[PDB]
Amino acid sequence: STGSATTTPIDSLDDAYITPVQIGTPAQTLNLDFDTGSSDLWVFSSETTASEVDGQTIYTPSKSTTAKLLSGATWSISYGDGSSSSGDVYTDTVSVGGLTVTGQAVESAKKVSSSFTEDSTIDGLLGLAFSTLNTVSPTQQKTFFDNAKASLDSPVFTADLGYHAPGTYNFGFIDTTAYTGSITYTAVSTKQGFWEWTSTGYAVGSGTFKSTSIDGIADTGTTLLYLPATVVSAYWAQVSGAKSSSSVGGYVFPCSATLPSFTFGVGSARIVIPGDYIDFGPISTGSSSCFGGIQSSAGIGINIFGDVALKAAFVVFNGATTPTLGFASK
């Protein structure tokens, strides 16, 4: 089997991406944030604290003839960006772009933090990291991909995020028309439950490539690119007026700037992030100071190849016995 779903930026700056997901019988379609950095599929629901729902589409398991309460099971997750949610668990039928899993753990939110409530466009998350990170207790649950893998033509999914445009998540096959050149595959460590790999270095604009190992995770659920402070300082040094603002919480730059590109290495290959991909617009409405899309990972504890990086590539998440990652230009 295979699946193919369109993923769409939630706003004009690609602050995140939503992908429609069919849950239950009859189908309830929710727009979820596909997150290769976590491993819980959770949704706003009829169980969510009413004041914490503001515009989201909710899952109502009582209206699904295939929904079953997973007895005793609860979940609670906290994300690196400080957001959180928690609740109980159903199993139900979940389909993504034609690909159907029965008995998928659908984690129903009873509580969500304010950033979720305030995001009317995201109805939940669909985790695509390794199931070892799943928070369901006392019985850990499998991700959608883990459940689907055996049935897929090939045990893979691919992320093709667009810049200021829709893209695609494919399950079970590699669309050889969606990229240019070849896919370069690189080793993955699953020891932290992430799609963790080692970039072979970087370049700023038209500068020389710096060969240096950068360990990090491929994370569709993080918006920006988080790299070591040395790397990030080298990038923003090339933008006149750019500075790190502790009050804003990262590198800011004059909105009048033309940003240089940023290249990262995958083995001997090179993915080029265009400078425009690194502009996340004014820090506040009307400001001429713009927020940068490349930020320091210092104090996160891990480097994160988020959407800023991934959207410059066609990314293969190869879930074979020994997982790997593939990157192609597109």
Curated annotation (Swiss-Prot):
<comment type="similarity">
    <text>Belongs to the peptidase A1 family.</text>
</comment>
<feature type="domain" description="Peptidase A1">
    <location>
        <begin position="17"/>
        <end position="328"/>
    </location>
</feature>
<feature type="disulfide bond">
    <location>
        <begin position="255"/>
        <end position="290"/>
    </location>
</feature>
<keyword id="KW-1015">Disulfide bond</keyword>
<keyword id="KW-0732">Signal</keyword>
<feature type="active site">
    <location>
        <position position="199"/>
    </location>
</feature>
<keyword id="KW-0064">Aspartyl protease</keyword>
<feature type="active site">
    <location>
        <position position="35"/>
    </location>
</feature>
<keyword id="KW-0645">Protease</keyword>
<dbReference type="GO" id="GO:0006508">
    <property type="term" value="P:proteolysis"/>
</dbReference>
<dbReference type="GO" id="GO:0004190">
    <property type="term" value="F:aspartic-type endopeptidase activity"/>
</dbReference>
<protein>
    <recommendedName>
        <fullName>Endothiapepsin</fullName>
        <ecNumber>3.4.23.22</ecNumber>
    </recommendedName>
</protein>
<keyword id="KW-0378">Hydrolase</keyword>
<keyword id="KW-0865">Zymogen</keyword>
